[PDB]
Design an enzyme around this catalytic site. Structure first.
Site, mmCIF file in Angstrom:
data_model
loop_
_atom_site.group_PDB
_atom_site.id
_atom_site.type_symbol
_atom_site.label_atom_id
_atom_site.label_comp_id
_atom_site.label_asym_id
_atom_site.label_seq_id
_atom_site.Cartn_x
_atom_site.Cartn_y
_atom_site.Cartn_z
ATOM 1 N N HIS A 46 -33.551 45.500 -59.332
ATOM 2 C CA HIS A 46 -32.792 44.517 -58.533
ATOM 3 C C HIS A 46 -33.674 43.771 -57.554
ATOM 4 O O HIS A 46 -34.617 44.328 -57.010
ATOM 5 C CB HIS A 46 -31.670 45.151 -57.728
ATOM 6 C CG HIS A 46 -30.875 46.115 -58.520
ATOM 7 N ND1 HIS A 46 -30.804 47.429 -58.164
ATOM 8 C CD2 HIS A 46 -30.087 45.956 -59.603
ATOM 9 C CE1 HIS A 46 -30.023 48.060 -59.029
ATOM 10 N NE2 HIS A 46 -29.595 47.198 -59.922
ATOM 11 N N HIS A 48 -33.406 42.654 -53.879
ATOM 12 C CA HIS A 48 -32.674 43.004 -52.640
ATOM 13 C C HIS A 48 -32.848 41.892 -51.608
ATOM 14 O O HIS A 48 -33.806 41.097 -51.695
ATOM 15 C CB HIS A 48 -33.127 44.375 -52.139
ATOM 16 C CG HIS A 48 -32.645 45.521 -52.961
ATOM 17 N ND1 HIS A 48 -31.726 46.444 -52.488
ATOM 18 C CD2 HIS A 48 -32.909 45.878 -54.242
ATOM 19 C CE1 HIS A 48 -31.506 47.344 -53.425
ATOM 20 N NE2 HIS A 48 -32.205 47.023 -54.508
ATOM 21 N N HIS A 63 -28.339 44.415 -52.458
ATOM 22 C CA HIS A 63 -28.728 43.467 -53.521
ATOM 23 C C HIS A 63 -28.599 42.061 -52.972
ATOM 24 O O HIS A 63 -27.663 41.796 -52.226
ATOM 25 C CB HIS A 63 -27.867 43.611 -54.773
ATOM 26 C CG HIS A 63 -27.985 44.942 -55.416
ATOM 27 N ND1 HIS A 63 -27.244 45.295 -56.523
ATOM 28 C CD2 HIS A 63 -28.757 46.018 -55.105
ATOM 29 C CE1 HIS A 63 -27.514 46.527 -56.853
ATOM 30 N NE2 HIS A 63 -28.444 47.013 -55.991
ATOM 31 N N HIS A 71 -21.145 43.467 -57.841
ATOM 32 C CA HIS A 71 -22.288 43.914 -58.658
ATOM 33 C C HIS A 71 -21.921 43.809 -60.136
ATOM 34 O O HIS A 71 -20.758 44.115 -60.539
ATOM 35 C CB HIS A 71 -22.689 45.330 -58.258
ATOM 36 C CG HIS A 71 -23.834 45.840 -59.054
ATOM 37 N ND1 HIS A 71 -25.151 45.451 -58.842
ATOM 38 C CD2 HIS A 71 -23.846 46.653 -60.131
ATOM 39 C CE1 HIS A 71 -25.905 46.025 -59.744
ATOM 40 N NE2 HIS A 71 -25.150 46.782 -60.523
ATOM 41 N N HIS A 80 -24.306 39.927 -58.675
ATOM 42 C CA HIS A 80 -25.187 39.471 -57.588
ATOM 43 C C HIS A 80 -26.321 38.656 -58.209
ATOM 44 O O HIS A 80 -26.738 38.958 -59.343
ATOM 45 C CB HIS A 80 -25.738 40.668 -56.831
ATOM 46 C CG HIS A 80 -24.710 41.596 -56.284
ATOM 47 N ND1 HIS A 80 -24.853 42.976 -56.313
ATOM 48 C CD2 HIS A 80 -23.552 41.343 -55.631
ATOM 49 C CE1 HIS A 80 -23.830 43.517 -55.675
ATOM 50 N NE2 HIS A 80 -23.016 42.544 -55.262
ATOM 51 N N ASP A 83 -29.114 40.890 -59.541
ATOM 52 C CA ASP A 83 -28.768 41.917 -60.558
ATOM 53 C C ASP A 83 -29.570 41.680 -61.826
ATOM 54 O O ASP A 83 -29.074 40.977 -62.695
ATOM 55 C CB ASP A 83 -27.267 41.920 -60.808
ATOM 56 C CG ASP A 83 -26.512 42.552 -59.669
ATOM 57 O OD1 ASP A 83 -27.153 43.179 -58.819
ATOM 58 O OD2 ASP A 83 -25.286 42.393 -59.614
ATOM 59 N N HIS A 120 -35.206 51.528 -59.194
ATOM 60 C CA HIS A 120 -34.325 52.620 -58.708
ATOM 61 C C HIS A 120 -34.498 53.922 -59.504
ATOM 62 O O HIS A 120 -35.048 53.915 -60.583
ATOM 63 C CB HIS A 120 -32.878 52.136 -58.730
ATOM 64 C CG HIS A 120 -32.562 51.195 -57.629
ATOM 65 N ND1 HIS A 120 -31.988 51.633 -56.442
ATOM 66 C CD2 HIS A 120 -32.699 49.859 -57.527
ATOM 67 C CE1 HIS A 120 -31.780 50.586 -55.664
ATOM 68 N NE2 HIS A 120 -32.236 49.488 -56.300
ATOM 69 N N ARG A 143 -34.591 54.402 -54.070
ATOM 70 C CA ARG A 143 -35.546 53.326 -54.378
ATOM 71 C C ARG A 143 -36.918 53.943 -54.634
ATOM 72 O O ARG A 143 -37.516 54.509 -53.671
ATOM 73 C CB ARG A 143 -35.525 52.362 -53.201
ATOM 74 C CG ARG A 143 -34.115 51.883 -52.900
ATOM 75 C CD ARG A 143 -34.026 50.960 -51.720
ATOM 76 N NE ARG A 143 -32.616 50.635 -51.545
ATOM 77 C CZ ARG A 143 -32.151 49.623 -50.811
ATOM 78 N NH1 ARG A 143 -32.982 48.819 -50.170
ATOM 79 N NH2 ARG A 143 -30.857 49.406 -50.740
HETATM 80 ZN ZN LIG Z 1 -25.965 44.124 -57.535
#
Ligand SMILES: [Zn+2]
Ligand SMILES: *[Se]c1ccccc1C(=O)NCc1ccc(OC)nc1
Ligand SMILES: *[Se]c1ccccc1C(=O)NCc1ccc(OC)nc1
Ligand SMILES: [Zn+2]
Lengths: 153, 153
Positions: A46, A48, A63, A71, A80, A83, A120, A143
């Site tokens: 992702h 962020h 995100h 999401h 997002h 994403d 992640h 993370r």
């Molecule tokens: Zn997301």
């Protein structure tokens, strides 16, 4: 054509280099590179909101979501901007990354330069998980490695 | 107000956190924070063109110079946009950074988001040195630590 780059580092074995290229200001972004040190299987991938790594990857916040959506996966309309789904690692602990995305950009309000790319702990369920967190984080867990997305030569 | 942040790291003990704040898009940028592990004296302090840390601080390229000017000090009209002068370390190996600059920005075409902040081995001679390199790098030598400037909360 615009280029950007991200060096992924964290507190453990996970390290990678991700390249971004956008041929046209209105056009898809090619995302490619390699991440090593990953457990076999899917890892949430992702952009962020903050390019802040003051206290490590936690500082990057949620995100990147300029349009205030839920999401989702990269192929979903409801997602997002940040994403990018999952990268997949084999038993060799390497994910080869090769993505083309139409929602992120290297120009304009969807621009990801100066934001943080994060890989992640767990799989992103692409908002299909059926719990509340699925609609926020995709349940992708902690993370492993992150970096600020920078302008490339 | 726009905020940005940079975590400085390198191959040695030099590490720092630098904050940026700009109240108005056309306005001065406050730059502040702390760098530890520095030798006593002046250290060149510059925004470099690329936010690329692929092969360490060398990947950041030259000083950020969108106007094609010669190297100078922050108070000079003839300067690179990225020319923030020197930070000063005491015997405690810490530089307290406290700068206000009107030429860098966190908005518009002189934006430093997605570029690399670098702290250098030696003093920047602010282009007043006795040689050709003074007009390019200020003779500030190798790159001790760097980071990509990111968007902050
Ligand atoms: Zn997301
Ligand atoms: Se796209 C973005 C996001 C956040 C801050 C600044 C920007 C930006 O577009 N301006 C700087 C920029 C980006 C890319 C390139 O490509 C050569 N040049 C400048
Ligand atoms: Se910094 C820059 C240069 C050129 C175009 C656009 C930008 C820009 O600042 N956009 C991204 C941005 C930066 C900071 C914040 O703070 C909330 N939001 C967006
Ligand atoms: Zn310069």
């Amino acid at each position: 054509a615009t280029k950007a780059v991200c060096v992924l580092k964290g507190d453990g074995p996970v390290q990678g280099i991700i390249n971004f290229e956008q041929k046209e200001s209105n056009g898809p972004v090619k995302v490619w590179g390699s991440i090593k040190g990953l457990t076999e299987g899917l890892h949430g991938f992702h952009v962020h909101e903050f390019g802040d790594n003051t206290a490590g990857c936690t500082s990057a916040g949620p995100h990147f979501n300029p349009l205030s959506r839920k999401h989702g996966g990269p192929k979903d309309e409801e997602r997002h901007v940040g994403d990018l789904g999952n990268v997949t690692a084999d038993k060799d602990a390497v994910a080869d990354v090769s993505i083309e995305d139409s929602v992120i950009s290297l120009s304009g309000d969807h621009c990801i330069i100066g934001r943080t790319l994060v890989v992640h702990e767990k799989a992103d369920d692409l908002g299909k998980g059926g719990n509340e967190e699925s609609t926020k984080t995709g349940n992708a867990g902690s993370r492993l490695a992150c970096g600020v997305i920078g302008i490339a030569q």
